[PDB]
Amino acid sequence: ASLTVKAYLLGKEDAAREIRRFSFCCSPEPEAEAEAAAGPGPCERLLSRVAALFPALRPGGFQAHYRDEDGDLVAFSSDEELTMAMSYVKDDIFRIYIKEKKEC
Amino acid sequence: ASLTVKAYLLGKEDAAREIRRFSFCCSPEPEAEAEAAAGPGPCERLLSRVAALFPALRPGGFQAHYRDEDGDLVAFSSDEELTMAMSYVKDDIFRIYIKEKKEC
Amino acid sequence: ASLTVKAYLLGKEDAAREIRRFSFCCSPEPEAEAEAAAGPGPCERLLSRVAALFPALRPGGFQAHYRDEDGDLVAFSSDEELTMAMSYVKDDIFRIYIKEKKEC
Amino acid sequence: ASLTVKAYLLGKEDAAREIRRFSFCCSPEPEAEAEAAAGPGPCERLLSRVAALFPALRPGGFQAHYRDEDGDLVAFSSDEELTMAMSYVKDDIFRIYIKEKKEC
Amino acid sequence: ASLTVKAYLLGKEDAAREIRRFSFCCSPEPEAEAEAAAGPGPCERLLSRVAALFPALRPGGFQAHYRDEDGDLVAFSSDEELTMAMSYVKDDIFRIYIKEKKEC
Amino acid sequence: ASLTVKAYLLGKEDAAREIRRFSFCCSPEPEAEAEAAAGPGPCERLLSRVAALFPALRPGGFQAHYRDEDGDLVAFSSDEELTMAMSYVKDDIFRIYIKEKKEC
Amino acid sequence: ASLTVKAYLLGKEDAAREIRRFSFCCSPEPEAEAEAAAGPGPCERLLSRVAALFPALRPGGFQAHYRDEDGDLVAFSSDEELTMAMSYVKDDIFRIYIKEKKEC
Amino acid sequence: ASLTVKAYLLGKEDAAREIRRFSFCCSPEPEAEAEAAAGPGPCERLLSRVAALFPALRPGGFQAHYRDEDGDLVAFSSDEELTMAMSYVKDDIFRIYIKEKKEC
């Protein structure tokens, strides 16, 4: 399941500041034997890869979102919630919206 | 009865600060034999799950609401009152409005 | 006679602080034999149920009101006066206005 | 694989200020023995050549982009991302869009 | 079940031309023995009474409506559909909207 | 599965001429023994009921539609296609759009 | 591979006259043993299903198209050409455009 | 060298009547040993494949063209002239223009 993720980085008034467009492999998985318990999570591997590409942000300091049917930026941080996020993929493009974690 | 709950977290002037959108299983219930008296309540399981998702709040310190026909944020804390709250579900989306418990 | 009571709790400048919206069963009554003299009163059962729902008030320390045709908050504490209060029900919603009993 | 790169240098309101049009040799490679580990990268050789031609910019201080199917200026800085950039070549012209790195 | 019917007679651009406000006795019924099969229908008695009051219309030549939650003038002509019309009564006022049957 | 069908009857420029709003029982079914092969179809029972309510149309001479995500009036006449029509129900309201079968 | 086909039927000035929206199973295939040579073709099964749904056309008398990147209605009739047609699927919707075979 | 050929079939006033868009393998060639003298020619294989796809024409009765820099439909029938035709390929699309051979 080759899945393209188009990571929007949002700015001041929720206008996009930098777009990245990488590829992601959620349903694919490594070798079918346990070298660990079971890897990282599918949302933990996503946020580890969004943090690796953008130079403008550091890992652990950003909140990834998506747009639902109402147009609202629904956040996601879990991997049982990333599966609800990915039911909104249009063609193969999973558009996420990155916002940084400021003061309050 | 798969039931989607869209938890709005309200801010200063009752504007939404963070939206979460999980799923909830009120009318479904576990195995039909008593390992306890009867579980937690259907409102106790709801507020235990709203507190588990949001990192910005801690359990026991938030008041969940809903909008009635007048547009007012009617609160609910009981499970005989959650059944009156859930007669306002539109499609399958049960929109609740979370407010934190401050000083006075 | 299923009758919905929307209990407004008034605040500083008679602005509503918490709304509750329960259901009430005035004209319905229990089994048609005397286990007591005749229960509590229909206003005594109302004020016992308004005190049970709100955590912010304690029983015996609040004055329930209603709005008449002039817009004035007419109080009621009797059960021969609750019958005059309930001649202002609009659809099935009996809006009462709760005020607490302070110093003077 | 002779590949023409048409380097647009963008200005104030993303209008082109200077166009350069050089040639690039991504899939071609030098002698088939290791005088080093493996050269520079195919994106490192591209940005070293865009910086060599334009007198108006200095190396390390510009962000190269491309247009995707949505019309958005998707940036690229990696060489596993330059391979996704180059799947948008039209005839043999790989149009990149240069933007300088200002204050914030 | 005393039920007030406020019959709006609509005009050119669906503006009310004459309002009548009578009373109606749907759930009440005559003597509990069959002098006929079972009377007229509860919608047949309604349209026979709307035609009796208005001098501007003649029976069989008008279409009675109601407003649903969307604001649309939903028509009704059956008595299994009048029961769905009467689930929109607000206090005890059942507002119907009369339109005459013209050419096409 | 109580399911409300709001039958729009379209006019000249696809503007609604008469709206009907009945109820429909697709997934419910009669007694669990065969008095026939298996009844009519779930789309055959729907179009038999839309034709029964509207006086302005006669059975066999109308095409029922629905709106998909693109806003287009997708027609349906089969009962393996009515199941795809009914995946667009919003709350419990299944809005169909009736058009009559004219010359060409 | 569940694949939705949205069959536009074109009219006089290539404006759509009737839209159908069925589902298609190209890459899925029946039991893995030969009851025949190898079924019909994947384009022969498509045109047999488009002809089965539309009442306005008869099989063998219509030309199915698709839109390429230029906006042109490229026809297809082969099954080595249907595989080039299906590289333009957007989400899972394979929009074909039906035109009938008239005089000349 | 995968090469896409978009075969326009021209009509009365040189307006396109049917477009076909197949793929062609000019510079690729079969096994590197002589089962014949040397196959057909690269223009003979092209015109044998254009005649195989279009049902509206028969082989030997059509003239394939291309557009040069002046906008003129330059014909080609040789395979030392097809190599001059294919120096006008834009991305990988080799647009030819088919005209049938009528009376005079």
PDB file of N, CA, C and O in Angstrom, chain B residues 89-92, chain F residues 89-92:
ATOM      1  N   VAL B  89     -28.504  13.461  18.503  1.00  0.00           N
ATOM      2  CA  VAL B  89     -27.535  13.019  17.508  1.00  0.00           C
ATOM      3  C   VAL B  89     -28.105  13.268  16.119  1.00  0.00           C
ATOM      4  O   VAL B  89     -29.300  13.072  15.868  1.00  0.00           O
ATOM      5  N   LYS B  90     -27.270  13.783  15.226  1.00  0.00           N
ATOM      6  CA  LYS B  90     -27.806  14.223  13.948  1.00  0.00           C
ATOM      7  C   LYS B  90     -27.719  13.116  12.909  1.00  0.00           C
ATOM      8  O   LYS B  90     -28.750  12.619  12.449  1.00  0.00           O
ATOM      9  N   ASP B  91     -26.509  12.712  12.531  1.00  0.00           N
ATOM     10  CA  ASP B  91     -26.389  11.582  11.619  1.00  0.00           C
ATOM     11  C   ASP B  91     -25.918  10.341  12.364  1.00  0.00           C
ATOM     12  O   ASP B  91     -26.656   9.367  12.516  1.00  0.00           O
ATOM     13  N   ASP B  92     -24.677  10.387  12.837  1.00  0.00           N
ATOM     14  CA  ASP B  92     -24.192   9.526  13.909  1.00  0.00           C
ATOM     15  C   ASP B  92     -23.187  10.282  14.762  1.00  0.00           C
ATOM     16  O   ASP B  92     -22.413   9.658  15.498  1.00  0.00           O
TER      17      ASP B  92
ATOM     18  N   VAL F  89     -27.387   8.336   3.158  1.00  0.00           N
ATOM     19  CA  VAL F  89     -28.346   8.832   4.135  1.00  0.00           C
ATOM     20  C   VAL F  89     -27.612   9.660   5.179  1.00  0.00           C
ATOM     21  O   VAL F  89     -26.500   9.318   5.604  1.00  0.00           O
ATOM     22  N   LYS F  90     -28.191  10.802   5.539  1.00  0.00           N
ATOM     23  CA  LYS F  90     -27.446  11.723   6.381  1.00  0.00           C
ATOM     24  C   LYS F  90     -27.741  11.483   7.852  1.00  0.00           C
ATOM     25  O   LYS F  90     -26.849  11.073   8.603  1.00  0.00           O
ATOM     26  N   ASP F  91     -28.975  11.725   8.281  1.00  0.00           N
ATOM     27  CA  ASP F  91     -29.319  11.404   9.658  1.00  0.00           C
ATOM     28  C   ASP F  91     -30.174  10.148   9.715  1.00  0.00           C
ATOM     29  O   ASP F  91     -29.746   9.100  10.212  1.00  0.00           O
ATOM     30  N   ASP F  92     -31.388  10.259   9.191  1.00  0.00           N
ATOM     31  CA  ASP F  92     -32.181   9.117   8.763  1.00  0.00           C
ATOM     32  C   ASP F  92     -33.011   9.495   7.545  1.00  0.00           C
ATOM     33  O   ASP F  92     -33.986   8.808   7.229  1.00  0.00           O
TER      34      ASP F  92
END
